[PDB]
Design a protein around this ligand. Structure first.
Ligand code: SF4
Ligand code: SF4
Ligand code: SF4
Ligand code: F3S
Lengths: 156, 961, 99
């Protein structure tokens, strides 16, 4: 338990700022999606399919303050920062991942192809004798956008 | 103190496979004269579980009950270790020199076979390569339970042989006419199941649905998930269908069906079918004379449906008349004409009624040669008994039912020295050394490949893909103009019906030493480990027998049915569904087995008899009585003349359910399309939310601010991304009962014995409980319901709270995972749960497990020791290898990257399982559906597997009532 | 038996005590065999309907519980004194200072 809680309090802040910058991006995309696919799809559940995440993402912001303030209030318990940080990044990467799964379907209808830039798209585990996932994570990371997914569809 | 259990890796590394990770080989699975597709896991070249072939559109990735037990037939003990001659296990190397010298310089040699029905070109072509030399090869395909009887009825109807396919998605209304189209006993169980289920699958406040009209003679699983079922003795269903068509318009046909002019369920459906031309279907079961299947051709052609009863021309195979050959075989046995007798995969001493003798001929003839998997009653009586491979070591070829042309991948070397698969043995008869089936089989394809790419791009492609794509026979048109209309007066009566019928869990007894199947509840009645006779209470109360229980164990009377002086008795059980004067005695279960392993006694201080299910012998001994030899082989499913004698030896008969008929409780809540059209919010209306409070799921507890989902330590992992849940489209769920067996193999278990399950314990995690619902017992109309019930891995989860030894926890993603380590066995994990699904490893069944089955328990999950609970876990094992594979490389989990066993096996696509909070997946569509049936939600439990209700679809009036 | 107990001023008679005190207790072993189990089968499903057949080893443990009870109750009882002789002669007899 190296040096207390105050060390981790810098990186937990560095996560919440990524969320705050994504309030802009998600709500910005929520404008753009209404602009891009006005009538090119069902859009009646499928637009709200993107909004339903948004009320959760904003709800976690007020929480991420409450999560964090319960840590910075008393820096004498190491077994809350690793957990609050493990919760944030999961509650963060989830919402990043949930935005994507709803956003890849956008291309799936506008384009007849959900693109080959969709995911790592590696394969099953027995397809490691040919393709270790190491290759794949350097494909996915260096090709796939987290939330530049629909702005990418402004190029289409 | 612990042992030093070593590790013995490869020496000559096969390049493709790797140690820790399986890889999916794509085999087939023969039975009943056809070959279902299949897909194995093959952990390091050892098969552990079978799965479906998602590419093959006939199955689209599904596996009924009858396959997953065959996986254990592979790994049985007491199979065929030594080659037995005369009954002595003597030796093999002399047999090859023997049989080779018999074969090359033989000449005429007048041999006979009595094969399993071929359904394969290598077999049927090697037959010609065989028959080229030896003059007369009588070549009887001894169909299990006689001629299939769907086909012989149609060789005259269309003038040439043919098989049907029966889509059922392009077709709504289905008069079954005893047809167990949804029956694991019957063939094409998937395509009958799926596109029937899709008709039953709504996903809407109202849609056009099948509305079958089943008229069974014996209550069967197809009659359950059904509408307007009727009970009417077989041997008279022809008379039923007789007055049927006269109310449709094909012909007069009045005399056979004399007494059904104006019956409600006849005149009802007739107007409908003529009102549904491109949608109506007329099937026909197996308990009939073939004129019924002429009527299945006459009306179904006349009805206008041909693309809905997709019809396909076989390879000129009409000659399967059981009388014409099998008697004609032994008519040559008694004359000393036929010398050799080459059985392949069959027990005709067990089967093959005494009315047309077999054993009387078998002892007459030497040079008998039984290729065989077990050693039952035929090895013991023969002079040569080869051992046999299972299909997993055959290089066999095989046709799917009526369609494609698949091929087996053999996975494992022959587990036993000198197994000598039937095909190369049948070629060993062809006057050469044992043909390498790998090279033999290939030599046929070049004559019949039908693919412009050569083998090492096509062979590699078909052996990969599991199915030769373009095959599937050409489709015949209407041949019949009312030819087959002249075998009616076989509607004979005047006696108790003694009809036979094959349970979904066994098929002519050929898979009896099979615990996953043998300890498998039948869907009708959760019966295990004994053949039975099921009948009405009105005959029982007019005969004098009962299914009395004063200990919740169903003590049972007997029958001692007597046909032509060939009587045996058996337990009588009772069901409120069957009609007067009829009993459905199931086969198998009377198959004597001869053991090589010891009985494994241990001191009386130690328990072995209750645990060592493989101890007292092999399995198939004394589990019931043998019943096949009694019948008459003319229309060899039915029978008359059973001079019943209610005698003693009234012994137990054991079940899991032990009861039935909920007292008007909220556990199925059937509903009509009329009512469903009125109140889509009816899955909740039985126990709705409260006066002004929230909808039931996501209902707050006392706590909401300190709830762990609001605390980090449950929320902080690589898992919360994807909450897991598992709905059940109960509208297509009928007692296939394969929802179980894949759980048993994927997430390993032991079996349980009669002596043990009698006290009521069974280590089947997924109960498949059935229920009856009558109109307050109005006319004793059962109107069954089936519904699986895994551990709905709750949120509030009483069980989690209560393990003091923290062996339970709401793991992330709704998973409520058990650990088979931390528990201690105080069992109060189970007592809380409304659904008594926390099973418990009472005895140490695995310790007594032999050196044979141990191949089968898959090398990925924690087999469990005495004093430990266990439950569903949503087949967590394949969540882990997937989510782990997504932790390596950043990704989500696809809509179908993971498929559970209850999912991937249930051929009706009932279970879907896709992760909650992933809105594009099927679960969110199937949960957002109107009938999110939440079973016993009222206890404020908030569980996943928020499954669906059934919507039985009755008929508008049409003189129905 | 309790509402048949109070008759002759609580039934001071000693031999009735033994034949009653047993029978009062036998219902207790049923009270906990009833309350626990009679609602532990037939609980929220028909699927979980099963009678409880007790084995011949269930009963020898019950009996053995009487065995070890008497075995060890008698053991120390013969060593320690039965009656609370310290307070007996200190409470009701003339230990009171009013004499
Ligand atoms: S859900 Fe289970 S019982 Fe229903 S059809 Fe599928 S495997 Fe059979
Ligand atoms: S239903 Fe039973 S097994 Fe399932 S989560 Fe609830 S308490 Fe545990
Ligand atoms: S998830 Fe596995 S263990 Fe659970 S019921 Fe389904 S198949 Fe059986
Ligand atoms: S209550 Fe708990 S300790 Fe085990 S036996 Fe049951 S999970």
């Amino acid at each position: 338990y190296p040096g207390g809680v105050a060390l981790t309090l810098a990186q937990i802040e560095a996560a919440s700022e990524q969320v705050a910058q994504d309030l802009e991006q998600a709500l910005a995309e929520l404008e753009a999606l209404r602009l891009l696919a006005r009538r090119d799809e069902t859009l009646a559940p499928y637009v709200a399919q993107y909004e339903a995440i948004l009320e959760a993402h904003q709800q976690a912001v007020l929480e991420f303050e409450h999560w964090k303030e319960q840590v910075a209030a008393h820096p004498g318990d190491y077994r809350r920062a690793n957990r609050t940080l493990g919760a944030i990044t999961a509650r963060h990467e989830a919402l990043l991942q949930q935005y994507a799964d709803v956003a890849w379907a956008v291309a799936q209808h506008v384009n007849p192809a959900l693109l080959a830039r969709a995911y790592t798209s590696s394969g099953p585990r027995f397809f490691f004798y040919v393709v270790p996932p190491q290759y794949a994570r350097q494909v996915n990371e260096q090709a796939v956008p987290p939330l530049q997914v629909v702005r990418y569809l402004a190029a289409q | 103190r612990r042992p030093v259990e070593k590790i013995l890796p490869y020496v000559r590394q096969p390049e493709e496979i790797i140690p820790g990770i399986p890889l999916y080989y794509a085999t087939a699975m023969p039975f009943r004269g056809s070959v279902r597709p299949l897909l194995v896991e093959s952990h390091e070249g050892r098969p552990t579980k079978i799965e479906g072939n998602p590419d093959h559109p006939l199955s689209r990735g599904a596996t009924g009950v009858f396959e997953q037990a065959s996986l254990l037939n592979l790994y049985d003990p007491d199979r065929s270790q030594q080659v037995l001659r005369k009954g002595e296990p003597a030796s093999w190397g002399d047999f090859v020199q023997f049989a080779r010298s018999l074969a090359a310089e033989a000449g005429t040699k007048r041999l006979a076979v009595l094969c399993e029905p071929s359904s394969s070109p290598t077999l049927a072509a090697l037959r010609r390569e065989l028959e080229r030399r030896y003059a007369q090869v009588r070549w009887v395909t001894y169909r299990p339970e006689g001629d299939d009887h769907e086909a012989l009825g149609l060789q005259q109807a269309f003038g040439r042989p043919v098989r049907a396919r029966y889509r059922f998605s392009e077709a709504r209304v289905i008069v079954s006419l005893d047809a167990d189209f949804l029956g694991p006993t019957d063939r094409n169980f998937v395509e009958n199941t799926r596109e029937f289920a899709a008709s039953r699958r709504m996903e809407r406040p109202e849609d056009e649905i099948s509305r079958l009209y089943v008229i069974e003679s014996t209550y069967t699983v197809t009659g359950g998930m059904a509408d307007h079922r009727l009970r009417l003795r077989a041997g008279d269903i022809p008379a039923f269908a007789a007055a049927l068509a006269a109310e449709l318009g094909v012909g007069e046909l009045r005399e056979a069906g004399a007494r059904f002019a104006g019956h409600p369920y006849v005149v009802e459906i007739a107007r409908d079918l003529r009102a549904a031309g491109a949608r109506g279907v007329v099937l026909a079961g197996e308990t009939q004379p073939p004129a019924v299947h002429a009527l299945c051709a006459v009306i179904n052609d006349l009805l206008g449906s041909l693309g809905r009863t997709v019809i396909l021309h076989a390879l000129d195979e009409p000659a399967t008349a059981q009388h014409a050959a099998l008697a004609e075989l032994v008519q040559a046995m008694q004359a000393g004409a036929v010398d050799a007798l080459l059985l392949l995969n069959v027990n005709p001493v067990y089967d093959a009624p005494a009315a047309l003798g077999f054993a009387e001929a078998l002892a007459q003839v030497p040079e008998v040669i039984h290729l065989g998997l077990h050693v039952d009653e035929t090895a013991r009586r023969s002079t040569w008994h080869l051992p046999s491979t299972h299909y997993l070591e055959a290089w066999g070829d095989g046709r799917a039912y009526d369609g494609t042309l698949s091929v087996i991948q053999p996975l494992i070397a022959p587990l036993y020295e000198a197994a000598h698969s039937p095909l190369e043995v049948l070629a060993l008869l062809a006057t050469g050394e044992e043909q390498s089936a790998y090279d033999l089989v290939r030599n046929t394809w070049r004559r019949l490949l039908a693919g412009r790419g050569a083998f090492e791009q096509a062979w590699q492609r078909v052996l990969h893909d599991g199915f030769l794509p373009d095959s599937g026979y050409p489709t015949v048109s209407l041949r019949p103009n009312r030819q087959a209309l002249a075998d009616w007066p076989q509607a004979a009566e005047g006696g108790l019906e003694v009809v036979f019928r094959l349970d979904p869990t066994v098929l002519d007894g050929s898979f009896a030493n099979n615990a996953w199947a043998q300890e498998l509840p039948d869907p009708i009645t959760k019966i295990v480990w004994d053949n039975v006779a099921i009948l009405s209470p009105k005959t029982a109360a007019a005969l004098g027998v009962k299914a009395e229980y004063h200990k919740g164990v169903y003590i049972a009377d007997v029958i001692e049915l007597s046909l032509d002086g060939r009587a045996v008795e058996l337990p009588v059980w009772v069901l409120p569904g069957h009609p007067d004067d009829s009993i459905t005695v199931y086969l198998g279960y009377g198959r004597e087995i001869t053991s090589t392993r010891p009985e494994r006694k241990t001191p009386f201080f130690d328990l072995d008899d209750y645990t060592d299910i493989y101890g007292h012998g092999a399995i198939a001994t004394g589990v019931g009585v043998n019943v096949a030899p009694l019948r008459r082989p003319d229309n060899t499913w039915v029978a008359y003349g059973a001079q019943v004698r209610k005698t003693g030896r009234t012994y137990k008969i054991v079940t899991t359910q032990d009861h039935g008929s909920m007292v008007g409780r909220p556990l199925v809540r059937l509903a009509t399309v009329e009512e469903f059209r009125k109140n889509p919010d009816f899955a909740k209306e039985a126990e709705p939310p409260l006066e002004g409070l929230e909808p039931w799921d996501q209902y707050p507890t006392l706590w909401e601010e300190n709830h762990p989902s609001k605390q980090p330590a449950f929320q902080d992992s690589d898992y919360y991304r994807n909450q897991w849940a598992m709905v059940i489209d109960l509208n297509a769920c009928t007692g296939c009962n394969a929802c179980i067996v894949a759980c048993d193999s994927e997430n390993n278990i032991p079996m349980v014995g009669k002596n043990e399950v009698g006290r009521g314990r069974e280590m089947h995690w997924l109960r498949i409980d059935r229920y009856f619902v009558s109109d307050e017992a109005h006319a004793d109309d059962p109107q069954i319901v089936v519904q699986p019930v895994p551990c709905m891995h709750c949120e509030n989860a009483p069980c989690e709270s209560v393990c003091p030894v923290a062996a339970t926890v709401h793991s992330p993603d709704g998973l409520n995972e058990m650990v088979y380590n931390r528990c201690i066995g105080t069992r109060y994990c189970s007592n809380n749960c409304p659904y008594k699904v926390r099973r418990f490893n009472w005895f140490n069944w695995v310790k007594t497990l032999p050196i044979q089955v141990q191949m089968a328990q898959n090398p990925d999950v924690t087999v469990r020791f005495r004093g430990v609970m266990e439950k569903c876990t949503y087949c967590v094992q394949r969540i882990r290898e997937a989510q782990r594979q997504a932790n390596i490389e950043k990704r989500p989990l696809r809509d179908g990257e993971v498929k559970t066993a209850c999912q991937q096996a249930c051929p009706a696509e009932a279970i879907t399982f896709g992760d909650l909070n992933d809105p594009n997946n099927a679960v969110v569509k199937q949960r957002q559906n109107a009938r999110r049936y939440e079973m016993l939600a009222a206890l404020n439990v908030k569980p996943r597997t928020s499954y669906l209700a059934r919507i039985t679809n009755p008929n508008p009036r049409l003189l129905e009532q | 038996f309790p509402q048949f107990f109070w008759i002759k001023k609580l039934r001071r008679n000693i031999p009735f005590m033994f034949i009653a005190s047993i029978v009062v207790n036998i219902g207790m072993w049923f009270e906990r065999f009833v309350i626990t189990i009679t609602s532990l089968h037939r609980d929220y499903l028909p699927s979980s309907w099963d009678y409880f057949v007790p084995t011949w080893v269930d009963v020898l443990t019950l009996i053995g519980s009487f065995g070890l009870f008497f075995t060890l109750f008698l053991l120390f009882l013969r060593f320690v004194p039965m009656v609370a002789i310290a307070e007996v002669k200190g409470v009701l007899p003339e230990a009171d200072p009013h004499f």
